[PDB]
Structure formats: structure tokens, C-alpha cells
Paper text:
The Klebsiella jumbo myophage ϕKp24 displays an unusually complex arrangement of tail fibers interacting with a host cell. We observe the tail fibers are branched and rearranged dramatically upon cell surface attachment. This complex configuration involves fourteen putative tail fibers with depolymerase activity that provide ϕKp24 with the ability to infect a broad panel of capsular polysaccharide (CPS) types of Klebsiella pneumoniae. In this study, we combine cryo-electron microscopy methods, protein structure prediction methods, molecular simulations, microbiological and machine learning approaches to explore the capsid, tail, and tail fibers of ϕKp24. We determine the structure of the capsid and tail at 4.1 Å and 3.0 Å resolution.
After classification, polishing, and 3D refinement, the tail structure (EMD-14357) in its extended conformation was determined to a resolution of 3.0 Å in Relion13. The full-length sheath protein is composed of outer and central sheath components. The outer sheath component (light blue) is located at the tip of the sheath monomer, pointing outwards. The central sheath component (orange, and dark blue) consists of the C-terminal domain, N-terminal domain, and two long extensions. The central sheath is essential in sheath assembly and contraction. To facilitate the interactions between tail sheath proteins in the tail, the two long extensions from the central sheath (the N-terminal extension, residues M1—S21; the C-terminal extension, residues A667—G689) can connect to the C-terminal domains of two adjacent gp118 proteins located in the ring below. Additionally, the C-terminal domain can connect with two adjacent sheath proteins located in the upper ring. Thus, three sheath proteins from two different layers link together within a so-called ridge. Furthermore, the structure solved here suggests that the subunit-connecting extensions (C-terminal extension) of the sheath protein gp118 function as hinges during contraction, with the central sheath of gp118 likely maintaining its structure.
Residue numbers in the entry:
A (entry chain L): 1 to 689
B (entry chain A): 415 to 689
Write the structure that this text describes.
């Protein structure tokens, strides 16, 4: 039940019954689908830079509370994240933070230390069993000179300038035994949360010193082999301030660790290392991208000088005494947190003040929580503020430059309901990058559903904004990579009343269609055929009784809108892009994404061919075309037909270091109108003649 | 340069002044300090270029030096569990060791330092300043630094590996050609060492044997990066002196293109399919 695996002695160990434990799921190698969206959100933990992620690992990279619609992290993009995870899109995550987020949680450990005469107790035999007037006997010796300890666990205070003293704490005057000034507080260790969130405030840790009789029985052989006393260490985490903790196991599925003080505690018999910080950090963490898990604690810090000084003092005092080894190396054997050796013989001449005396009891049942931290101000208002802060400053951001094609493979951006001020900073993505695609919405999710006139006004404003980023600045071709979707409703996949726009529905459709990890469109999910042309994740849509004039005006202004299919459902009569000219090639919206992917293939060709000494002009020209055609052929499901041509024109001859490519592509459109008429015949002249 | 401090970095360039068969790779990083920012990279690059400019290839005619290169960047060594920072000169050093280090003195075609999998970083991770702006990258290129870019989400690659030759010549623009020329300079020394101080030679035999030696040693060694030709003779000054003869090598090389364009035209499906 209690004793652990010490060696090879034939034996069967029983670990009791237990309830199911969550198992971290292994991930797969990343790839580039044709639909690669970027999603910005508030989270619980994880990195704060754009990250290409496979949806299997979202839960354990960003915490599983970020996708809960009832939690504190819900914003108007959580439905988008959930739909992406359900469909299985490798997408790019960006975790934002509010402008007023506090620092991390911290906890420092210290000992109040003094020397003085104290009492001594009876002994039954050499086992030194008697203590604290056990049985019926008063303590025996009148006064025995010894030491008094009182442990302290408390928040690490910051500097007056607003900087934490994580590694820069110093000793101070104590409070126990103030009759003698030397009563001093000396620090022993520091602990800090890895992230900035309430997870730190809810994280807890335990440290204790077991003996032969503990529930996790210790062994004296290992301590003799390597002279150092071994302490048990445990990490726990709770759900909320009112719940109860649950053990955070190591990557090898263990509840606790054994650690010790010293330089390098290597066991020759098995080559295992018992160093405190090294062992903790190596056992509780796993950075491998496929099996990824980060412990809430950061790397612990230890005050070696002070711990060594206290150990030396207690050794010099009582190591040359009746029931403790006097040797020099026993310094690290000295039991500090407890008051006895591994066999369980109490240290007389040492007194640890209990709870009533103002101390802290370090046992397996005591729990200690980090102090401080927080998430910041959450909600849609702060989310919009942060999103605007990121999007407005794209050309001079010091956090990341998102004109990097190779490092940021995202190619799509969906407007999930940002406010109108943030909406107008989105169009510049298709101006700054030549392989990007945008979907916009005319509804501000935090306001009331717009009327017909407000729809028209917002649509006109967005068209005006889009008019400033032509596809070809040289020839002024109007933009065609994206679309605008009008309408809003309510989310159906949840009991709560949670309004969403129809960009969510089209987002799900595109995820299912062009989201395969092998880079080929799936014919069974064609966004304009079968059951994928109906609304499926939105209900109670507004403005369904548009007049004919209103519908005609919206169509002429190039919006995408729905109609009633039957008494229960809606559908899309035609899904066009916001191209403003009369060309029928660029009328469909999926063709825009196809063209974006073509632009990506061109970059890949360059990346592969650039900067080679021994190439020739003909080989360069041929290899460029080979690359583009091989990559693009057979992936667009017959929506396009394209052809590349590389060459070295006269300007390239002049320059001497450049070559040119040009892709010719063609597409179709759709019919939308039907006529109807009838004629009356007599039965005979209709049946024959 | 494996990461010497900036004081020691400035005593290395004199090797390509004191010897005619030497090749130096410099690093803009001090491994004992923090990873440098863009401005510090630029400052150290300018200082190293100023130091290098004092040792022209030809003192008689002031040809700018071209034997070596400067590499910027730093990261962490991947072949160890510990945390051990290193500069990218280590990765280039490994590439060159594999390419041009065979004991038989002929370049290996299967490890070309700018083809295949040798043009990517392989022994460094967590490189810094990978979000350079276009202006920063352009300035570094115009100052003749070698820097890496992102290949994909996982790795990096060298867009172009050039030497610190500062002129407009396209012959001396690749770093490998400098090493090739250093080897040529070694071959000339070998020819002299063999032919010096012989009683019974004639002038014609001396002249012929020098060219024979250089050509035989060099031909078939440089994997088609260079083409060279030696010429030995006895000029009028050599006639006047009476104990000297002259040799002169003519060589040529190429460069590499680095910029691509992109354009598109939209056709209707029928006129693109047939017409």
C-alpha cells in the first residue's frame, strides 16, 4: 500500500483503485490546407504570439477553459474556434491580452530562526519514542540549549518602482524570540507561476518530509548511498475559489516527486538524478510539439547560500551529539522541514513552532496557494479594443511583422462581429499581402440587429473602404479576394442565447470544404451544392421580409444574403464576391481563394529556386514552371484552369539577377433567373396531334 | 570566428593580409553577451567592415579584399540537451566541413553548400531577429552580410551566400570562389617549392614545369565553380635580374540571380482552353 519501488527484490506492488484520468492526446505533423484561417481570442494560458496549431492540441496548449461558452473567456470568436476544432482545420491562433493585465503569482518560503534554551523529553529506549509528555511523564531535563524555527509562506513583495524581487530577497529582523535580537527571517526558496492568469492564483503546492512510517514510506538505503534527505513535492490545481484541488501529475503519471538539497545527487546504482530544480523542471514539463504540456509552475529558484548556512549552523550545533551523525557530509542529510531522521527518531534541541504559535505545518495534508495574478478586464469591449490595437499597427508592430509569408502561413480572415471602428482596419490585409482573403460582416455583434437602412449604410461604407486597395496598383484592377455577408441570428449548438452573424455559417461551410489536410477540395462538401447551401448553425435570422427593391439593391451592391427555403430553413441564392466590375470570371467567391493559393505557389517556387550558383537560365525557367504546375494541378476541383509561364525578358537581361513568371487562369459563373409560362390545350389535341 | 569578444574580433582580419592563401569567416555576435538587436548588428557590421578595409587584396592596385565572409545571427546548439548558445558560423562551418574537406582534395557534388538540404540551417534553433523589416534586410544585403530567413514554420534557409567583396564585380560575389582562389595560391607555392634552386635546368624547362605543376594539381578539383589557366615566363625585369621567373593565373567564375516577379491575367474558360 505505502512502500515504493526501491530495487529489484521480487515483489508485487498494489496501487489502489482510482477514477479515470484525462490523458493528453498526441498530435500530428503540420501541413498546409487550402483554407488556413487566423483566429484571435482571449485564453487561459499559452504563448502570446501567432502559432500554427493542429486542433487536437488547442485544449492543452491554451487550456480547456477558453472554449467554454459559459466561462469568463467567451467572446464573439469562441464559436469560430469551436467550429474550427470540430471540422479539423489546422489554423493559426493568436492569444490577445487586455491592456491592464496584472503580473504573475508568486510565493516565497522563509524561516524565522533563533537560538535559546528549551525543554527535553523522556525516552522509552534508544528509539527515542517519547515526546510532548506522552504517556504520563513530565519533560526530563531542566533546560537543553537548542534552536527554534517558525516557517513562513507568503507573497513576494515588489520594488517601489514596480519590479518584483523574485531573485533579490534579503534577510530581516524576526518576530519569534524578540527578547533576543538575532531572531531573524531568512529566505529559503521562491516559486512563481508560468503564465498570467487566474490559473496561478488557483495553483497550489505541497512539500513534506516522510519517514519509514509515512503513507509513502521512505528508504534509508538510498539516503545512505547518496547522503541527502529526500523530500516529497506535489502540485495541485482547483477549478474555482470554491472547488477542491486535483493532483497535477508528472509526464510519467506520478502524483509526487522526491527531491533533495545538494550539487548533483547522482545514484551510481541506477544513474538517477535527485536534484531539486532540475528534477522538477524535467519531470513536470514536455516541450515536444507532438506531446506538449507545460506545468503551471515556472522554474523554481533556491537560496543556496542561506539554506547552506542554516544547515551548517544546525550541524555544528547538534551533529556532534547523541542521536545524530557528526560527519562533515551529513550537512545535506540534516532534516530541515521535519524534526527527525529517516528512521523517525525526533531531534531534541530543535523546536518548530506549530500553528497556534504562528508557524506553518509542512505535511502531506497542508496546501499552499500562490498569491496574486489575474486575467484582466474581459469581455467584448476589451476584446475589440485589443483587436484594434493589433490591427491598426501592422507596419510598425514590435511584437510581430505579419507580412512574413514563410513564418505566418495564414491566408484567410473572417469578421466575426467586430465593431465598425475595427472593421475598417481589416481590408488592408489584402493590400499588404498578395495571398490573403477576407470575409466581412455588416453586423456589430454587441449592438441591436440592424435595419435595412443601417445594413445599406454599413455596406456602402465597407465598399468605400475596400475601394482603396485595388488588386493591381499599376492598372487599378478592383479587389476580388473576399466577400461581404449580411445578416445575423442566434447560435443553435448551445442552450444559452448567444447571437452570431452568418459569417459563422459560411465559415463552417468553407472549413468543411477546403479544410482537408492533404490540400485537395472535397467534392462531397461543395459549398454551393446539396445540403451545404443551406443555413445550418443559425436560427431566427432577421429582415427576412425584404422587399423586391431592397433585395435588388443589395444584389447590385454585391452583398451575400439568404432567403427562405421552406417554412423552416434558409439558403443562399448566390454566393458572389465583392468584385465591382462586369467580368464573369471573378464572380464566384471560391475562385478568389483558389487564386490566393496560386499566389502562394509562386512564392514557393521562388523560395526553392533562389540564390544558386550553378543554375542556368533555361534550367531556372523550366524548374519554376515545373514547381507551380506540379503543386497546383488537381487540387482546385475543376473550379479553375491555369497555366504558368516563366522567362527572362529584356528588363531581366538588363538587370542580370531577375526572372519573371506569369500565370493565365480562367473560370466560370452561374445562372440565377428562370421564366415561366403555360398554354391551355384540349385533352385530345394535347394527347395526340 | 566562434564568438570571440569584439576586441579579439578585430585582430583576426590581418590573416588575409599576412598570408595569400587564407580565408576568414567573421561573426557579429559575442556569445558571452545578450543576443544583439538590429542596431547593434549594424554597428558591429560597420566596425568589422572598416577593420577589413585596411587589408586590400592587392596593395599595388588596391583591390578590395574578397577572401572570407561575415555571418550575422545566433541561436542554441541542437546536438545537446543543455542550453548552449552558438552563432550561425557553426552551421556554415559544418556545411563547409562536409562539402570541401575530403581527404582526396576534390569537392563532393553531393553536399553543395547552396543546393538541396545544405542550404538550410541544421544545427541551430531559436534564432533571433527573424522579423527583420524590408529596410533592415535591404541594408544588410547592401552591406554584404549573410543572413537567414524562414523557409517554413519549422526551419530557415540562406537566400544568398555572398562574400564581403564591396565592388560591383560579379566574379567575386560567391563566398566559395574565395576558398578556391586561396587553393590556387597554395598550388603556386608548391610549384616554386618543387622547382627552386636547381643547377641543370634551362629557362624553357623551368617555365614549362611551373605551368605543368599548377595545371595538373588544379584540374578536376573545383567541381566546376571556376575555370583557370596558368602562364609562366621570364620578363625583361627577370632577364635583368637573372634569378627570378614569373607566373600569372587567369580565372573566371559566375554569380546567381535572386529576384522574381509575378503577374496574372484572367481569361474566360473557353478562350483559355482553346485560343
Amino acid at each position: 500500500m505505502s512502500e515504493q519501488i526501491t530495487g529489484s527484490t521480487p515483489r508485487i506492488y498494489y496501487r489502489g483503485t482510482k477514477d479515470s484520468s484525462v490523458t493528453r492526446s498526441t498530435g500530428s505533423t503540420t501541413t498546409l490546407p487550402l483554407h488556413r484561417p487566423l483566429i484571435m481570442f482571449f485564453g487561459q494560458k499559452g504563448p502570446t504570439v501567432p502559432t500554427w496549431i493542429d486542433p487536437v492540441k488547442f485544449e492543452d496548449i491554451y487550456g480547456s477553459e477558453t472554449t467554454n461558452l459559459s466561462g469568463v473567456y467567451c467572446t464573439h470568436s469562441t464559436p469560430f474556434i469551436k467550429e474550427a476544432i470540430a471540422a479539423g482545420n489546422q489554423f493559426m491562433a493568436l492569444r490577445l491580452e487586455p491592456s491592464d493585465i496584472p503580473d504573475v503569482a508568486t510565493l516565497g518560503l522563509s524561516v524565522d530562526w533563533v537560538k535559546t534554551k528549551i525543554d527535553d523529553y523522556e525516552r522509552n529506549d534508544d528509539g527515542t519514542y517519547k515526546l510532548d509528555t506522552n504517556g504520563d511523564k513530565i519533560p526530563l531535563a531542566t533546560q537543553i540549549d537548542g534552536i527554534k524555527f517558525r516557517f513562513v509562506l507568503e507573497k513576494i513583495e515588489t520594488n517601489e518602482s514596480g519590479v518584483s524581487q523574485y531573485k533579490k530577497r534579503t534577510a530581516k529582523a524576526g518576530t519569534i524570540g524578540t527578547e533576543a535580537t538575532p531572531s531573524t527571517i531568512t529566505p529559503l526558496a521562491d516559486f512563481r507561476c508560468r503564465f498570467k492568469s487566474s490559473l496561478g492564483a488557483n495553483t497550489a503546492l505541497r512539500i513534506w518530509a516522510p519517514t519509514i512510517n509515512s503513507a509513502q514510506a521512505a528508504d534509508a538505503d538510498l539516503q545512505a548511498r547518496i547522503k541527502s534527505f529526500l523530500y516529497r513535492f506535489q502540485i495541485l490545481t482547483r477549478a474555482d475559489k470554491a472547488s477542491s484541488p486535483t493532483i497535477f501529475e508528472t509526464i510519467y503519471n506520478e502524483p509526487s516527486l522526491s527531491v533533495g538539497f545538494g550539487e548533483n545527487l547522482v545514484d551510481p546504482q541506477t544513474e538517477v538524478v535527485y536534484d531539486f530544480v532540475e528534477r522538477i523542471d524535467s519531470r513536470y514539463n514536455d516541450e515536444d510539439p507532438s506531446t506538449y504540456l507545460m506545468s503551471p509552475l515556472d522554474t523554481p529558484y533556491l537560496y543556496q547560500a542561506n539554506i547552506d548556512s542554516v544547515l551548517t549552523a544546525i550541524q555544528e550545533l547538534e551533529a556532534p551529539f547523541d542521536t545524530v551523525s557528526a560527519d562533515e557530509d551529513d550537512l545535506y542529510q540534516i532534516n530541515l522541514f521535519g524534526a527527525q531522521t529517516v528512521e523517525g527518531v525526533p531531534y531534541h534541541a530543535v523546536q518548530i513552532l506549530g500553528v497556534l504559535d504562528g508557524g506553518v505545518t509542512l505535511t502531506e495534508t497542508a496546501t499552499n496557494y500562490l498569491q496574486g495574478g489575474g486575467d484582466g478586464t474581459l469581455g467584448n469591449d476589451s476584446f475589440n479594443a485589443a483587436a484594434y490595437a493589433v490591427l491598426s499597427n501592422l507596419s510598425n508592430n514590435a511584437a510581430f511583422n505579419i507580412t512574413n509569408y514563410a513564418r505566418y502561413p495564414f491566408n484567410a480572415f473572417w469578421d466575426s462581429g467586430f465593431d465598425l471602428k475595427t472593421k475598417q482596419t481589416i481590408p488592408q490585409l489584402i493590400g499588404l499581402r498578395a495571398d490573403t482573403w477576407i470575409a466581412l460582416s455588416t453586423q456589430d455583434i454587441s449592438s441591436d440587429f440592424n435595419s435595412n437602412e443601417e445594413e445599406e449604410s454599413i455596406a456602402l461604407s465597407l465598399m468605400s473602404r475596400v475601394s482603396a486597395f485595388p488588386d493591381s496598383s499599376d492598372f487599378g484592377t478592383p479587389a476580388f479576394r473576399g466577400m461581404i455577408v449580411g445578416g445575423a441570428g442566434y447560435y443553435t449548438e448551445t442552450t444559452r442565447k448567444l447571437p452570431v452573424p452568418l459569417t459563422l455559417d459560411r465559415f463552417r461551410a468553407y472549413c468543411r470544404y477546403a479544410g482537408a489536410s492533404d490540400g485537395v477540395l472535397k467534392p462531397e462538401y461543395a459549398v454551393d451544392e446539396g445540403d451545404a447551401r443551406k443555413v445550418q448553425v443559425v436560427k431566427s435570422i432577421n429582415n427576412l421580409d425584404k422587399s423586391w427593391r431592397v433585395r435588388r439593391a443589395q444584389w447590385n451592391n454585391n452583398l451575400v444574403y439568404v432567403e427562405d427555403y421552406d417554412t423552416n430553413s434558409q439558403f443562399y441564392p448566390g454566393q458572389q464576391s465583392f468584385y465591382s466590375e462586369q467580368g464573369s470570371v471573378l464572380k464566384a467567391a471560391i475562385v478568389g481563394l483558389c487564386v490566393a493559393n496560386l499566389n502562394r505557389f509562386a512564392f514557393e517556387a521562388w523560395r526553392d529556386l533562389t540564390g544558386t550558383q550553378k543554375l542556368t537560365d533555361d534550367q531556372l525557367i523550366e524548374r519554376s514552371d515545373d514547381a507551380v504546375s506540379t503543386r497546383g494541378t488537381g487540387a482546385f476541383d475543376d473550379r479553375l484552369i491555369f497555366t504558368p509561364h516563366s522567362e527572362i525578358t529584356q528588363a531581366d537581361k538588363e538587370r542580370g539577377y531577375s526572372w519573371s513568371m506569369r500565370i493565365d487562369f480562367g473560370a466560370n459563373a452561374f445562372r440565377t433567373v428562370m421564366d415561366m409560362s403555360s398554354v391551355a390545350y384540349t385533352r385530345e389535341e394535347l394527347a395526340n396531334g
